[PDB]
Amino acid sequence: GADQLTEEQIAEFKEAFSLFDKDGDGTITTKELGTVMRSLGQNPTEAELQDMINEVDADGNGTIDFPEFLTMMARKMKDTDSEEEIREAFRVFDKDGNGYISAAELRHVMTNLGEKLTDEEVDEMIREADIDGDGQVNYEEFVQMMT
Ligand SMILES: [Ca+2]
Ligand SMILES: [Ca+2]
Ligand SMILES: [Ca+2]
Ligand SMILES: [Ca+2]
Ligand SMILES: [Mg+2]
Ligand SMILES: [Mg+2]
Ligand SMILES: [Zn+2]
């Protein structure tokens, strides 16, 4: 849902993040999250606070940065949020929007993104990611292509 947030919503979330981030180091700790929760009448344990962070902790460093905070504010988990971002990346290559990346689409978009590969490199990239062997890369294959 983080992709559906408006500009004013994001600007308000920036103000909120700054109030959570007491020491201004750009990350929210369990200590900082706990302060906020208790100001709102809750008493989460340290384990419950760490779990709130883990649910959005895409990089696994144990703290919330602002992109992860946007996941939290959209009331989403990190797995759904990452799937939204992978699907956005997929759509960049799927120029004709049919749900499959062709060799010509991969060559075209990679070229315009500054990496001009030979026709042989593109065919090789397609074949390696093409699991079901239909000659194209669907979304589920695109995810494994990126791991
Ligand atoms: Ca901090
Ligand atoms: Ca993190
Ligand atoms: Ca396509
Ligand atoms: Ca395929
Ligand atoms: Mg969304
Ligand atoms: Mg966006
Ligand atoms: Zn995200």
Side-chain angles (χ1 to χ4, degrees):
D3 52 353
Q4 311 185 68
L5 296 173
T6 78
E7 177 176 0
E8 289 94 76
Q9 288 187 305
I10 288 169
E12 291 188 290
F13 294 151
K14 285 190 181 178
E15 295 183 85
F17 186 86
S18 294
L19 290 167
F20 278 68
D21 183 16
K22 271 62 99 166
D23 62 6
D25 77 335
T27 83
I28 296 168
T29 62
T30 59
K31 184 173 161 223
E32 285 166 328
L33 186 59
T35 305
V36 173
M37 297 309 300
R38 290 185 285 273
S39 79
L40 294 177
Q42 314 304 296
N43 57 347
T45 69
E46 177 72 23
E48 289 168 346
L49 289 162
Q50 189 54 62
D51 284 341
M52 295 180 58
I53 292 183
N54 291 358
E55 288 173 350
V56 307
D57 191 15
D59 67 355
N61 71 347
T63 56
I64 309 179
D65 59 31
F66 185 59
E68 298 165 346
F69 193 71
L70 290 179
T71 308
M72 192 174 96
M73 290 298 105
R75 296 157 294 101
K76 298 282 171 292
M77 307 273 185
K78 60 179 178 181
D79 59 339
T80 305
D81 173 74
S82 67
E83 289 168 39
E84 289 184 1
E85 287 154 0
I86 299 168
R87 197 164 292 262
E88 282 188 342
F90 180 88
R91 292 172 200 130
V92 172
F93 294 92
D94 185 16
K95 182 171 180 174
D96 72 355
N98 68 346
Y100 305 86
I101 300 173
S102 71
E105 282 170 335
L106 182 67
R107 172 180 60 182
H108 178 86
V109 175
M110 288 285 291
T111 300
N112 290 340
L113 291 180
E115 218 191 303
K116 190 42 191 103
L117 322 163
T118 79
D119 295 4
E120 277 60 272
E121 302 183 88
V122 175
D123 295 353
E124 196 144 340
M125 286 185 62
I126 290 288
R127 273 170 35 112
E128 292 176 62
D130 188 11
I131 302 305
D132 57 19
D134 66 350
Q136 299 197 82
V137 177
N138 62 18
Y139 174 81
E140 309 78 0
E141 291 160 344
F142 180 77
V143 179
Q144 309 193 27
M145 169 180 175
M146 302 300 186
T147 52

